[PDB]
Amino acid sequence: MKIAGIDEAGRGPVIGPMVIAAVVVDENSLPKLEELKVRDSKKLTPKRREKLFNEILGVLDDYVILELPPDVIGSREGTLNEFEVENFAKALNSLKVKPDVIYADAADVDEERFARELGERLNFEAEVVAKHKADDIFPVVSAASILAKVTRDRAVEKLKEEYGEIGSGYPSDPRTRAFLENYYREHGEFPPIVRKGWKTLKKIAEKVESEKK
């Protein structure tokens, strides 16, 4: 049997892409993911995870990583939830090796709902298992999670080489906050690396205009 795991990175940041990654591993290769301790990789530094990333690739039968830029996210036709479901499906449907069973991180507050909707969007037969924090539960999802996180960090790293210190890209991050406030104060607009619909932008813009003297 072929087992697939699928997760996402970059859900709530205001800057950068959202990355959805799907991995496929043969049953016999599952112990390898445990050997790699993919489940205990949350505390790893980006460089150590990159090494893990490369190791994971060596045991996978197949994988798909979709890097969705802020332009794509912003032009979406549906809600962000629908967007996530839609792209999880696209990633799985793009796989060369079709999984018999799919383990997915439940984006939707309703795990059952997510599994149902994802499956209805697949163009092949498979059992879909969706759970909250599935990445702490199933090593195969943990693996996908690592591919998505690494891809996402690489993306932001590339952005820093072009815009300087932009932080992690999350509004909660002081550097990301300052970067956006200062850029708006200097240009009266936000850079083309932000997600146009994020409420964070409106608040920063209003704050900045408030200061003006």
Residue ranges covered by each domain of the chain: 2-161, 162-208
Whether 71 has a binding-site annotation, put simply, is no
- Backbone torsions φ then ψ of 10, nearest 5 degrees: 80, 45
- Helix/strand/coil for 196: coil
162-208 CATH, one of 3.40.50.2030, 1.10.10.460, 3.40.1640.10, 3.30.479.30: 1.10.10.460
Q: Are 171 and 198 in contact (CB under 8 A)?
A: yes
β strands within the chain, DSSP E: 2-9, 18-26, 62-68, 101-105, 127-131
Whether 8 has a binding-site annotation, put simply, is yes
Both tokens of 120, joined, read 């209805």
Residue 194 DSSP symbol: B
Q: Which CATH class is domain 2-161?
A: alpha beta
Nearest residue to 59 via CA among 91, 30, 18, 90: 30
> Any idea of the CA torsion for 188, 192, 195, 200, to the nearest 10 degrees?
-30
Nearest residue to 5 via CA among 149, 154, 150, 128: 128
Whether 61 has a binding-site annotation, put simply, is no
- Helix/strand/coil for 126: coil
- Helix/strand/coil for 107: coil
- Helix/strand/coil for 5: strand
